[PDB]
Amino acid sequence: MSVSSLLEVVADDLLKLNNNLKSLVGAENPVLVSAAEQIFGAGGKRLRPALVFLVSRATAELAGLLELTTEHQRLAEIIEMIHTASLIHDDVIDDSGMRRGKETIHQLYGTRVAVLAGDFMFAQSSWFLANLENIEVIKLISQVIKDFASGEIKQASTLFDCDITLDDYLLKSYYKTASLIAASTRSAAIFSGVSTAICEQMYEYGRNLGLSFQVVDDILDFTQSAEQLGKPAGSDLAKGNLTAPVIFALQDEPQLREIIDSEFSETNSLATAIELVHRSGGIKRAHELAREKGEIAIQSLQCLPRSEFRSTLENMVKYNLERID
Amino acid sequence: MSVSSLLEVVADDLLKLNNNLKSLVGAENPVLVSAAEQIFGAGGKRLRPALVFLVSRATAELAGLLELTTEHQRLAEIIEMIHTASLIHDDVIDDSGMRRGKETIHQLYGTRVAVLAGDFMFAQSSWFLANLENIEVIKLISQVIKDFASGEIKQASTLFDCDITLDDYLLKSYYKTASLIAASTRSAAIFSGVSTAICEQMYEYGRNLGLSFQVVDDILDFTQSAEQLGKPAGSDLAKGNLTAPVIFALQDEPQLREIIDSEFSETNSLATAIELVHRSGGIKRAHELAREKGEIAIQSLQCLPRSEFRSTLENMVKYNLERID
Amino acid sequence: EAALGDAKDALYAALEGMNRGIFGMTSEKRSEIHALVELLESKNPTPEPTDKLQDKVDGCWRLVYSTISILGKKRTKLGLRDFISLGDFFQMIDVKEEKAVNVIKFSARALKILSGQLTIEASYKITTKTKVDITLDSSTITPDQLMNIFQKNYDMLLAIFNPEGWLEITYVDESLRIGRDDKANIFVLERADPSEV
Amino acid sequence: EAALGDAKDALYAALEGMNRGIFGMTSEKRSEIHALVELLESKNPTPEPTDKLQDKVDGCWRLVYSTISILGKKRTKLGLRDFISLGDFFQMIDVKEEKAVNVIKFSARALKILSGQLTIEASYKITTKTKVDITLDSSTITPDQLMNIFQKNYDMLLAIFNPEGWLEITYVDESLRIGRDDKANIFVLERADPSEV
């Protein structure tokens, strides 16, 4: 029911990881020391690294280990660095501003520093990955990076496409977020040394959790008040990016089709369309879809024996589903 | 004595590689199809990929193979993509204009496209590298990328440092260019399957050739007329980047030290300093240094048996040394 | 009549700042501009356009407004949200050979000197005194780089600017001309010089 | 005397556009500005600064020009090339406790609301009628983020702006003041209000 109450079980490892990341990036460089401190914040932002640590401890308890190997820590760092670099470069791309205000580092430090820092993080992650010394995990992570790049390139060609399927949206969202979390859980299980079927189960867990997160984010984009963010709701809708509620609503109203195809030329077509979507009930169907994904994830977690990290993962699912309130 | 006369021995492979690269990047995306065509040009720019192919054929002839494996082609593509991405991102960094006039992609297509394309090339290179399936080569290439990032970060902290050694300049230049060519030659030899000592010899060859190139470029930066480029000579000198002639001259004149330490405050201190460097004779000593590097490379090439690719490599060394005319 | 004059300059004042109405247009502004052109054609100047093809219609014309609108999916596929811009539209009329040509200039933000031309030559007919008929003859894209870009959707591009069907002519002024087509579209276009073409 | 007035405003006109002469200065401009200040001192408006410390000197002063020049390797190390800007320099003087203080305001390009202060308090003496003597008292940096940034070269930063040694005072105007140090440097500074400080 609260982020900190969830993460407190693995807080010390996260503290160590933040310290290591700080010391790693911008060693002795002043402007990059300040950027480094700002970029990783302090604790928190832990969903992906905390997930890594939780799955690590659960599978290690199953496999009778006594403590986390250093490879698990390296893996957590790799995941964190990749996600941070992705966010930074995404900010510089499509030139939008004030992500949750939090003047993006592109505004705070400028384009040069942002591009340089993104490159530095990518390079360090590659070096650590090569040091891991397990060719299969390397293949997985490389696949993830390539899919992210391809998805970025492809999203430009699908703007305002007035007919797209649920599968296409799911696969785009998979390339956007789910692949990283799925690969992380599977790699953690591999480093813990458990059976193969359990690794497949963990992969499915990661997939479905990532999908749930992404869908819930799209839903929040519609209902949130403009002050809780910058641009008022339906920003990406105006930009030409269709979301799940839009797809569900498009199966009912042609007027929405003409408004979209009009490239929102007529005045107040934006608010008209938002009210249309609210009236069509696409939000309820998106809610149900998110619930199905979460249910699949919970059932997948039934392979691990009783524990407290299990309850932590299930409560993570509940907190995700409850963020919509 | 001419670039095309040198490269004509391996022209067909370069043609195939250009075709493959074009089809790979920007598949079906229009703006990126145009960017792709412009970026890789047509043939030429072959120093690094042509070097790869030449060493491949020489070592394959020694090792009794009959034709290039597909891994050699993948390796050439990897090297080319890494170098191109490095150049693009370097253009966006430090925000300078005119690439040999040839406006850079950053001016022609804008910041968004440039950053996106650099990321795409890095990601594809990582994917191919992981597909190579040889952990040692992966380690080498990862080392190269990390060293480039670190060198970029470090060069900012050494601007206008009025006392630096020849070793420091050599190591910075190693991080800038030589590591890529050295790694390429060594990896090619490994994929060809020859003895280890010959691989070490090839590594030394690549190192010394890269060093020679970089030093000759710094020399040309001083003597070229402003029209043969954009900014007149001594551009990087004005920016705070010391080169080899400057280092050699600093051991003789204190007035140069004060002019540099004055951050070129006094008017016409730039031309005064250029004439000082010309008078001190740092250019002759830099010429000798380049010749020593080339001589080491030529002696290193004595391990390969008689051939025509051997003559091609030696003539490459001669053409490098002769570009100064 | 000077009422034609202030009507046409009222049109000029209305149409500005809209890019010839090719990238979207609010409902009321569209309403008023088409009501204005209705007013213009109602106060008909010299009628019977076929008798004045060689006289009024002969020559070149640049498009000032039309009901053609590139939107959404097609605009995204052709890459018109960015990276390519439509210079303008010319419809040099060859009454001498009973032909006509539509050239469209494409440009980019100095991406190259591209300045390409899509040329569609068509053959028309004198069928009626106002409603002529016209059919396609041939098409081309120059230079080769622009063709390299557009190769895929060349067909859709032709379909959008397909200059065939019938055309009822109206308001054949010594300066501009109004015309409705088989597609019930509207084209208002003004004289120019073939040199600037 | 009005000759002092137009001397000082000629100085004002000369000095502008140079950031108080801290980031480099061409030779001839330096030559002429120090020639000007020699003329000013020439016309001493109030001698015997010690009797007028509490009268003329007591209070606050902001730096308008000095011979301190942060340039080159030091400037690069301190990241003053482009990450941080020097707001200004203040030298509030405390004759009551026979003390003084030098505060330097640092700012970043809205990186945070840094607006940091480096402070050095200092104990001074009445040694001679013009040339007083001063030593340190202590130093500090606020807030902790700027201190985190500068931790390494805190010492060099002190060494640059070290406000100790002897100080010959001259031209104690009701508005400005000229002074020289043991380091033979020159400082010209002007009154201000402690509130803006």
Curated annotation (Swiss-Prot), chains A, B:
MF terms in GO: all-trans-nonaprenyl-diphosphate synthase (geranyl-diphosphate specific) activity; metal ion binding; prenyltransferase activity
Where is it mostly found? plastid
User: For isopentenyl diphosphate, which residues are the binding ones?
Assistant: 45, 48, 83, 100
Named cofactor requirement(s)? Mg(2+)
> Any note on cofactor binding?
Binds 2 Mg(2+) ions per subunit.
Alphabetized UniProt keyword annotations: Chloroplast, Isoprene biosynthesis, Magnesium, Metal-binding, Plastid, Transferase, Transit peptide
Keyword Metal-binding in annotation: yes
For this protein, the Enzyme Commission number is 2.5.1.84
Enzyme class, UniProt record, top EC level:
transferase
Which reactions fall under this protein's catalytic activity?
Answer: 7 isopentenyl diphosphate + (2E)-geranyl diphosphate = all-trans-nonaprenyl diphosphate + 7 diphosphate
Q: Where does the protein end up?
A: Plastid, Chloroplast
Chain residues that bind Mg(2+) 1: 90, 94
Give me the residues that bind an all-trans-polyprenyl diphosphate, please: 99, 176-177, 214, 231
The protein's assembly and partners? Homodimer.
Q: Which family does it belong to?
A: Belongs to the FPP/GGPP synthase family.
**This chain belongs to which protein, by name?**
Probable solanesyl-diphosphate synthase 3, chloroplastic
The species is Oryza sativa subsp. japonica (Rice)
What stretch of the complete protein does the chain hold?
Answer: 91 to 414 of 414
Curated annotation (Swiss-Prot), chains C, D:
> What sections of the protein cross the membrane?
none
A GO cellular component annotated for this chain's UniProt record is:
chloroplast
Task: Give the location in the cell.
Answer: Plastid, Chloroplast
In the UniProt record, the signal sequence range is: none
How is loss of this gene reflected in the phenotype of the organism? Reduced growth and sometimes seedling lethality. Strong reduction of levels of plastoquinone-9 (PQ-9) and complete loss of plastochromanol-8 (PC-8) in leaves. Severe increase of photoinhibition at high light intensity.
Gene Ontology BP, a term: plastoquinone biosynthetic process
Q: How does it assemble?
A: Interacts with SPS2.
Please describe what this protein does.
Essential for plastoquinone-9 (PQ-9) biosynthesis through its interaction with the solanesyl diphosphate synthase SPS2. Binds to the hydrophobic solanesyl moiety, which is generated by SPS2, in FBN5-SPS homodimeric complexes to stimulates the enzyme activity of SPS2.
**Which family does the entry's similarity section mention?**
Belongs to the PAP/fibrillin family.
Q: What is this protein called?
A: Fibrillin protein 5 homolog
Encoding gene per record:
FBN5
